[PDB]
Amino acid sequence: EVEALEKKVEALEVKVQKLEKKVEALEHGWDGR
Amino acid sequence: EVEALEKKVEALEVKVQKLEKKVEALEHGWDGR
Amino acid sequence: EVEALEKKVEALEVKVQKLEKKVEALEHGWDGR
């Protein structure tokens, strides 16, 4: 259970980092995004 | 503790999926968003 | 392990709340964002 939760949490960290990059690109208009 | 963490992690998955949909809509301009 | 996971989950909640605010601002154009 705990190890599986560690994996789901890391997966969420990956998804959140991607969202952060995409949101910063939209907020700042980077490269015309 | 562990079961409560499982619930919080699932709640985060729900919030992250919603954010992903909203961000993709903004990035692609779907339906004028 | 479990307490460390509790901390990572709270950190994710903070990041997700920030993303939600930023996305709502972009979706609604708040304050010209």
Side-chain angles (χ1 to χ4, degrees):
Chain A
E1 246 182 324
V2 172
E3 153 172 32
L5 270 154
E6 270 149 17
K7 177 173 186 202
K8 275 182 162 293
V9 165
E10 163 266 343
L12 278 165
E13 296 169 337
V14 168
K15 288 178 184 184
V16 164
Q17 172 183 109
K18 288 187 302 171
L19 283 162
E20 288 177 343
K21 290 180 177 185
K22 287 176 169 264
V23 166
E24 292 304 328
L26 293 168
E27 287 187 328
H28 294 97
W30 290 337
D31 308 290
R33 287 171 274 182
Chain B
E1 246 182 324
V2 172
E3 153 172 32
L5 270 154
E6 270 149 17
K7 177 173 186 202
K8 275 182 162 293
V9 165
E10 163 266 343
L12 278 165
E13 296 169 337
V14 168
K15 288 178 184 184
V16 164
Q17 172 183 109
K18 288 187 302 171
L19 283 162
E20 288 177 343
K21 290 180 177 185
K22 287 176 169 264
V23 166
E24 292 304 328
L26 293 168
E27 287 187 328
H28 294 97
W30 290 337
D31 308 290
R33 287 171 274 182
Chain C
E1 246 182 324
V2 172
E3 153 172 32
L5 270 154
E6 270 149 17
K7 177 173 186 202
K8 275 182 162 293
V9 165
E10 163 266 343
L12 278 165
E13 296 169 337
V14 168
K15 288 178 184 184
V16 164
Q17 172 183 109
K18 288 187 302 171
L19 283 162
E20 288 177 343
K21 290 180 177 185
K22 287 176 169 264
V23 166
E24 292 304 328
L26 293 168
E27 287 187 328
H28 294 97
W30 290 337
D31 308 290
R33 287 171 274 182

